[PDB]
Design a protein around this ligand. Structure first.
Ligand code: HEM
Ligand SMILES: CCCCCCCCS[C@@H]1O[C@H](CO)[C@@H](O)[C@H](O)[C@H]1O
Length: 466
């Protein structure tokens, strides 16, 4: 008896291979069913308390900073620096308070028209050769390109244009994301030694990518700042949008909050990463789930046909795309990004159920387990958008009491939750408006986990014009 009350899972080498190899969800789910809503994984240097229970997850997520960001904030410092997605303390409090006002309703309304619809129409245009010749297209890569192009336009008013062609800065983005994922699974953090970073090929390539990304963002910031200062631009209304530059960067510069240039670069870089692959993966799995579930796809097309009659979605249309919203909600239930949330106890605490943890205890919340647990959800493995009241509030962690956790919760909740849901709704509505879609047969659509749940082998679809 270690007096904590927490059962200890018995992990074998095969389980550890899964934890390091992109199949993290597999042993964690198996151990949830064997040991219950909370258990310990102590594998070598690591010691995690793994939480698979709504009530405990709620306690952990709402009690920030008692449960602090922990290992995650430490492993991705190389990419984000002190950007507020991983910063803590008064810096975090101030930067989040400064950035959240940029995501207001008028800004969202402008972005829907000029960014979400524009990039989704561009996606459809890039699919026209496949619609004509009937061949298969990897929609997971296409959605990744679209959501990258969206986030860059929304943050900087700059189009990476990865839907059209590759570029050095685009390659650098994926190189940086890869490095962040590998660092979370390295057996030995050799990259802490600076001399090894100068000779190990993976590290000298990662360092070049991070430099190019940081330089690109710095140049974008300096160019916008020159305009803002020269023109004497300041925020004078509530819900401010510069009509010529409807970007978050412009809003933040116009607000004239005291912030260093590097902190602003780090802030925007953290939003670039936070808003790209997550949104692309949500759209990927939603499209997969609809292509497996003809009744849902039919109901989704019926809604977009009736609500829009072929028009582009406007901001005011989004609240009427109710079933399409619940399709995305149910996709995020079955496939949460990331599938686990990380915390670390900063003081001793007692979790609901009288489970005791000490200062320093690393915590893993398996959102995948909570969403797929038969103790939490009926028919947990089925794609049923109808499980949500189509006339009720859109489900989230507060109104389901953390049985559904699509955007985390508590003080560190995702700040782009309204933004991202609106991007998925608009892009999926435009897709379903313009294209029929079928899953190519004989594929194995399986999960590989990193910062998001992505497919192991791609998501190949056939499309045709509607
Ligand atoms: C479907 C798309 C998205 C998903 C699934 C998602 C998911 C998440 C999750 C789970 C967290 C919390 C991590 C934690 O508590 O440890 C988070 C934080 C965050 N997200 Fe999102 N996100 C999405 C889109 C976006 C977008 C579009 C933006 C920016 C416009 C964004 C910006 C951020 C930021 C800045 C944070 C850090 C918040 C903080 O620590 O104070 N996300 N995201
Ligand atoms: C010998 C060690 C046994 C395996 C330890 C758990 C490895 C699972 S990867 C997991 O994914 C997160 C987000 O991607 C990272 O941030 C975490 O730090 C990391 O825990």
């Amino acid at each position: 008896n270690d007096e904590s009350g927490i059962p200890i899972a018995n992990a074998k080498l095969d389980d550890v291979a899964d934890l390091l190899g992109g199949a993290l969800f597999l042993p964690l789910y198996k151990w949830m069913n064997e040991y219950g809503p909370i258990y310990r994984l102590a594998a070598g240097p690591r010691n995690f308390v793994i939480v698979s229970d709504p009530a405990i997850a709620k306690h952990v997520l709402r009690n920030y900073p008692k449960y602090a960001k922990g290992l995650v904030a430490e492993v991705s410092e190389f990419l984000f620096g002190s950007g507020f997605a991983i910063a803590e303390g008064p810096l975090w409090t101030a930067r989040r308070r400064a950035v959240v006002p940029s995501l207001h309703r008028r800004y969202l309304s402008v972005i829907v028209e000029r960014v979400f619809c524009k990039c989704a129409e561009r996606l459809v245009e890039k699919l026209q050769p496949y619609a004509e010749d009937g061949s298969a297209v990897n929609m997971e890569a296409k959605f990744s390109q679209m959501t990258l192009d969206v986030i860059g336009l929304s943050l900087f008013n700059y189009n990476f244009d990865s839907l059209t062609t590759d570029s050095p800065v685009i390659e650098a983005v994926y190189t940086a994301l890869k490095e962040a994922e590998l660092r979370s699974t390295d057996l030995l953090p050799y990259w802490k030694i600076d001399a090894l970073c100068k000779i190990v090929p993976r590290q000298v390539k990662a360092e070049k990518a991070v430099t190019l990304i940081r330089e690109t963002v710095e140049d974008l910031i300096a160019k916008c700042k020159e305009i803002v200062e020269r023109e004497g631009e300041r925020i004078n209304d509530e819900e401010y949008v510069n009509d010529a530059d409807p970007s978050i960067l412009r809003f933040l510069l116009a607000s004239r909050e005291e912030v260093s240039s590097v902190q602003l670069r780090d802030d925007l870089l953290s939003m670039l990463v936070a808003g790209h692959e997550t949104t692309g993966s949500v759209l990927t799995w939603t499209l997969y789930l609809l292509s497996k579930n003809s009744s849902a796809l039919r109901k989704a097309q019926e809604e977009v046909d009736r609500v829009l009659e072929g028009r582009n979605p406007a901001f005011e249309d989004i609240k009427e795309l109710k079933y399409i919203t619940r399709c995305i909600n149910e996709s995020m239930r079955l496939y949460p990004h990331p599938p686990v949330l990380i915390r670390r106890a900063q003081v001793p605490d007692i979790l609901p159920g009288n489970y005791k943890v000490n200062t320093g205890q690393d915590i893993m919340i398996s959102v995948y387990n909570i969403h797929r647990s038969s103790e939490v959800w009926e028919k947990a493995e089925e794609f049923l958008p109808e499980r949500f009241d189509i006339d009720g509030a859109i489900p989230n962690e507060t109104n389901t009491d953390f049985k559904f956790i699509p955007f985390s919760g508590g003080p560190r909740k995702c700040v782009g939750d309204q933004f991202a849901l609106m991007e998925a709704i608009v892009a999926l509505a435009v897709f379903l408006q313009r294209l029929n879609v079928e899953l190519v047969p004989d594929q194995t659509i399986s999960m590989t986990t990193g910062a998001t749940i992505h497919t192991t082998n791609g998501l190949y679809m056939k499309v045709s014009q509607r």
